[PDB]
């Protein structure tokens, strides 16, 4: 759930490094922002850090 302890927006999506449209994912092309949905993206596994 959002705005809770696991608000993934801040810490990171459980859908690990997925964007909104679901194009870029799972550590594959880290320094790519989803050009479709314009969602700037970081935190694959920085669920361990943020």
């Amino acid at each position: 759930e959002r705005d809770g302890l696991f608000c993934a927006r801040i810490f990171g999506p459980v859908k690990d490094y997925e964007c909104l449209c679901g194009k870029y994912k799972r550590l594959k092309h880290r320094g790519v922002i989803c050009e479709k949905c314009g969602v700037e993206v970081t935190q694959t596994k920085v669920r361990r850090e943020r």
């Binding site: 194009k23 870029y24 594959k28 092309h29």
Partner: protein, 157 residues
């Protein structure tokens, strides 16, 4: 209600089975003949059968000792399914370059559609719109490339 995070009519049913089961265990004077639950709560068997899951199974904590003092905890005895594995991505990349190895000899677009769709994870019919051939030929050449990569040997089957 704030602290609990489970729905409400859940607990209605729970209180209800509690009342009923005590009441009727007094009626009978002994236990555990579930068909009585079925009849008295004449809704369905699967109803309470599911409810039994839904309600009666609660939270537990992570670091509790493992019993006969502190040999280990529950944090030792844990299992996972989504692990890393090193050679599948390895041979995946081998097969990617084998795809290239097959298709670099083949029509100009199809190499490119399958490259840029399979390489950097871009769009497929994005090219079907570019050529505007109906993708009949696309279908055909996709099949032939499959037939050509049924020309190699690799386990991980």
């Amino acid at each position: 209600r704030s602290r609990d995070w489970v729905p409400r009519s859940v607990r209605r049913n729970a209180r209800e089975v509690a009342q009923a089961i005590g009441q009727l265990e007094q009626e009978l004077g002994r236990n555990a003949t579930e068909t009585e639950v079925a009849e008295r709560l004449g809704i369905d068997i699967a109803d309470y059968r599911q409810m039994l899951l839904d309600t009666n199974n609660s939270q537990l904590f992570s670091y509790d000792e493992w019993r006969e003092e502190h040999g280990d905890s529950i944090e030792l005895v844990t299992d996972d399914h989504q692990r890393e594995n090193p050679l599948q991505q390895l041979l995946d990349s081998n097969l990617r370059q084998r795809v290239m190895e097959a298709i670099e000899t083949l029509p100009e677009r199809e190499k490119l559609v399958l490259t840029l769709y399979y390489q950097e994870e871009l769009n497929l019919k994005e090219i079907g719109a570019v050529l505007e051939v109906g993708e009949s030929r696309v279908s055909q050449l996709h099949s032939q490339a499959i037939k050509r990569l049924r020309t190699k040997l690799g386990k991980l089957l």
